[PDB]
């Protein structure tokens, strides 16, 4: 029980990219969770979280998402290191893209989870985002509907990134 891997997912893009990532971390388990059936309290037993969540149809938070969302000031993040990623469409929400995993960090950092992961904005082209940070991602931002041509790339760099973060 290493890594806890916890996503939710509209289409099944998120699902599917969880899966991508749970194999590049070759020598590592990544145990993988749909936030529609499980607890909050859950995140208490990785101090290694991986959080997925697409950038929302509707509103601002996956519906699952937005339903632990409330209850993620019971939890304590204090020691955790806690990395991000999404799916969303740079165009067609281009004042919206990645919201959401920007929305669940700055709650889990309050709460004292560690960011690692962070993820350079270069080859997207977007409006706004609450996921920003000093110019750079609060994590992987993929984009399936304009660039799904780089999505693997893009995971096997990231999954390395976090290997060297999480001591791997």
Same mark, same amino acid.
């Given at each position: 029980? !290493? ?8 289409? +099944? !893009?998120?699902?599917?990219? $969880? ?22 309290? &859950? ?12 950038? $929302? ?31 969303? &469409?740079?165009? +067609?929400?281009? &004042? ?15 709460? %004292?989870?560690?960011?690692? +992961?962070?993820?350079?904005?270069? %080859? ?5 985002? !609450?996921?920003?940070?000093? +110019? ?33």
């Amino acid at each position: 029980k !290493k890594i806890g891997l916890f996503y939710g997912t509209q289409t +099944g !893009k998120t699902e599917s990219v $969880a899966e991508i990532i749970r194999d590049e971390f070759g020598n590592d388990v990544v145990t993988l969770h749909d936030v529609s059936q499980a607890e909050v309290t &859950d995140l208490n037993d990785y101090q290694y979280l991986i959080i997925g969540c697409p950038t $929302a149809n509707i509103g601002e938070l996956q519906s699952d998402w937005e339903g632990l969302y409330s209850e993620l000031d019971d939890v304590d993040f204090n020691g955790k290191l806690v990395a991000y990623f999404g799916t969303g &469409d740079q165009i +067609g929400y281009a &004042d919206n893209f990645q919201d959401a995993i920007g929305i669940l960090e700055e709650k889990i950092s309050q709460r %004292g989870g560690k960011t690692v +992961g962070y993820w350079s904005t270069d %080859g997207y082209d977007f409006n706004d985002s !609450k996921a920003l940070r000093n +110019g750079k991602f609060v994590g992987l931002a993929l984009d399936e509907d304009n660039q799904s041509d780089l999505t693997d790339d893009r995971i096997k760099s990231w999954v390395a990134q976090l290997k060297s973060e999480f001591g791997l």
